[PDB]
Amino acid sequence: VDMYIERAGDITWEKDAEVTGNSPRLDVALDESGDFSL
Amino acid sequence: TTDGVYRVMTRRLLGSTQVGVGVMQEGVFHTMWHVTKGAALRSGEGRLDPYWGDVKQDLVSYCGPWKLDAAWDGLSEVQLLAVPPGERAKNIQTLPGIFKTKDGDIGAVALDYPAGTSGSPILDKCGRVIGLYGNGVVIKNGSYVSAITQGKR
Ligand SMILES: CN(C)Cc1ccc(C(=O)Nc2cc(Cl)cc(C(=O)NC(C)(C)CO)c2)[nH]1
Numbered sequence: 001v002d003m004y005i006e007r008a009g010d011i012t013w014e015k016d017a018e019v020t021g022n023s024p025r026l027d028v029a030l031d032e033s034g035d036f037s038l
Numbered sequence: 039t040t041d042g043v044y045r046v047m048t049r050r051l052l053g054s055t056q057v058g059v060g061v062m063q064e065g066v067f068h069t070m071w072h073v074t075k076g077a078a079l080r081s082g083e084g085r086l087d088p089y090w091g092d093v094k095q096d097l098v099s100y101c102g103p104w105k106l107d108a109a110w111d112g113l114s115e116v117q118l119l120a121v122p123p124g125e126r127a128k129n130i131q132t133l134p135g136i137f138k139t140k141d142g143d144i145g146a147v148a149l150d151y152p153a154g155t156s157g158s159p160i161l162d163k164c165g166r167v168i169g170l171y172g173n174g175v176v177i178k179n180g181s182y183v184s185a186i187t188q189g190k191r
């Protein structure tokens with residue numbers, strides 16, 4: 001078995017986390033292979 | 039098998055390489071199909087076997103059915119709990135955009151991380167997992183926009 005998992009953290013909301021990224025409204029297609037495109 | 043966020047690692051390539059990220063909740067490991075392609079996983083001396091998967095949703099669950107059922111409210115800021123290769127887990131807060139599809143609207147997070155970050159969980163203000171980051175599109179800039187990909191429970 002080639003693949004393995006390592007714990008990286010707890011799943012918690014962090015008050016006063018770094019706030020960034022934009023919020024685009026995009027027109028997309030989802031093909032049978034699970035690829036998104038514009 | 040403790041609840042939390044996990045790196046998915048392989049020793050097939052050079053050194054130890056991070057292929058992606060997943061979520062352990064209710065004894066089930068959750069990641070994106072393209073991270074593992076449905077392969078078995080090692081956990082200490084334990085082995086995790088795939089239970090459910092779908093290439094089109096790009097999700098897979100190990101040791102049981104998909105458990106994550108919370109949804110984006112369509113209104114509020116969320117946090118990406120990004121786990122980048124070789125770097126600490128880090129909460130990034132953002133307002134999702136939208137993917138408009140012929141079959142309805144999904145949340146979208148516009149944050150640039152390496153491909154090895156696929157499967158990082160997205161959180162609501164109560165800490166609940168509303169989906170996984172790491173399947174999406176490269177836009178004009180050269181930047182990445184991920185679906186908020188949630189399975190069915
Ligand atoms: C799921 N299958 C069928 C489709 C597929 C192939 C690849 C993907 C996919 O979404 N890959 C991916 C995931 C992530 Cl988290 C980041 C980047 C990325 O290129 N990020 C940059 C900021 C540009 C830095 O390299 C790319 N989906």
Ligand code: NA
Binds near residue numbers: 075
């Ligand atoms: Na396989």
